[PDB]
RNA sequence: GAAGACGGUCGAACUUGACUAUCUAGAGGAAGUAAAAGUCGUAACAAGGUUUCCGUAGGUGAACCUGCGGAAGGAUCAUUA
């Protein structure tokens, strides 16, 4: 299987596709994880480090995330199956890079990290601005400026 | 001595701009309370495993942690020329 980047598109002939996103649930109750084995892939695809759309899982399900160079897993603690994650795979686009002028999520981040700024760009028709305050991974990006 | 006309004086109503009082519709956003077999932790109650609480300022998935100055509603009404 592959798929489109976004769902909220119908459209088979839209610009943007990659692989399928897929998971381990791992131990027993009271100690069980979710395990993303594709994520440097997809991270590559998307052309992002691979912390920032793990990290988002944790921020919306309120859960805790883990990273590991020794072992080179991603983890979203808890069991996170099928729909849990697979109703919302869009999130990581839908609510930062679509365009509100156009639904082509082309788009750039650039981070101030000494003056607490995140500048967006988008190429589809030019919008361009900051990522939104209220939103939860502002505080994660800027103390992990991207490479 | 009839119709009619100039001038005053009451003043309904009409046009135009502004102010204002009630009721009422709405993209999208951000909160509160029911219900008690969803999810990730374990902040408080016994020294609750870093005593707790107040004012102020900074910081984070969340509960919350840290700096400065107070309170006991403390776990000491007491410590010896």
Partial sequence: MSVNVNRSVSDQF?????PRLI???EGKGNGIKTVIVNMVDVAKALN?????????????????????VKNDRYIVN???????????????????????????????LHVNPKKQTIGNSCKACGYRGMLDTHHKLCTFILKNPPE
């Avoid at 988002?56 to 859960?63: I, V």
């Avoid at 609510?95 to 788009?107: A, G, H, I, Q, R």
């Fill in 14 to 18: 839209y610009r943007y596709k990659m």
């Fill in 23 to 25: 998971a381990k649930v």
């Fill in 48 to 68: 992002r480090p691979p912390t920032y759309p793990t990290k988002y899982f944790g921020c919306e399900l309120g859960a805790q995330t883990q990273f590991d």
């Fill in 78 to 108: 808890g069991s996170h199956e099928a729909n849990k994650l697979q109703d919302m795979l869009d999130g990581f686009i839908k609510k930062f890079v679509l365009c509100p002028e156009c639904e082509n999520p082309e788009t750039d």
